[PDB]
Amino acid sequence: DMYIERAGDITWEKDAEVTGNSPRLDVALDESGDFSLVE
Amino acid sequence: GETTDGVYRVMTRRLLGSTQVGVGVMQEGVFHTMWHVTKGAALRSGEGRLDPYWGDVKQDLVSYCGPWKLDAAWDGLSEVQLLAVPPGERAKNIQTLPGIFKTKDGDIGAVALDYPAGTSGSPILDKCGRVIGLYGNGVVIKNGSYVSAITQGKRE
Numbered sequence A: 001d002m003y004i005e006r007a008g009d010i011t012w013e014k015d016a017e018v019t020g021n022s023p024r025l026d027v028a029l030d031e032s033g034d035f036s037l038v039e
Numbered sequence B: 001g002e003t004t005d006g007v008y009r010v011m012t013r014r015l016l017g018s019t020q021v022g023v024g025v026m027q028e029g030v031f032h033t034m035w036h037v038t039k040g041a042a043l044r045s046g047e048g049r050l051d052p053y054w055g056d057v058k059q060d061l062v063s064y065c066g067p068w069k070l071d072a073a074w075d076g077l078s079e080v081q082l083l084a085v086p087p088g089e090r091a092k093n094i095q096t097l098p099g100i101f102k103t104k105d106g107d108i109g110a111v112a113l114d115y116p117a118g119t120s121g122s123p124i125l126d127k128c129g130r131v132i133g134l135y136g137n138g139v140v141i142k143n144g145s146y147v148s149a150i151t152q153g154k155r156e
């Protein structure tokens, strides 16, 4: 039995921690909603 | 139950203790999360019940109490923020420039940020605070790192 609990407001934070790269990938999406890499 | 707009944890007591299986967005009276978090099951909010209203395994999305309401889209140029809600940890904003998933049916933004499975359903926002999609359905690339699609539904 699943339940939900509030965790916060949805707002943009000025000066949030900035990280992560921006990869460009060729992918396939199957009927089960799974993404996979195309090579 | 609590119907205030915002981000929420999705919990279960089926496993050991109380376990966070994902996250979602309450907006305009509708609860939005990824299909793989709830598997389409009903949810509790205090003493009230949230019933599924729309869902799609392929898109990996589900809405409760009404139709999908989120319709903002990544502009393809600007940095966005993941409002990560990890299990047992405070909600935190992470800013990043999305990458791209190129598919035979078009291109989708993707964020290269790695959080526990229970963070699935966390919202990705633009600079106006609009939800442009949910984090948690993606792929593991060559060097073993996680990249999530920016998954957004259609507002009918």
Ligand SMILES: C=Cc1cc[n+](C)n1C
Binding pocket: B114, B115, B116, B117, B118, B119, B120, B135, B136, B137, B138, B146
């Ligand atoms: C939300 C994160 C997530 C979803 C699936 N995986 C493997 N990971 C790390």
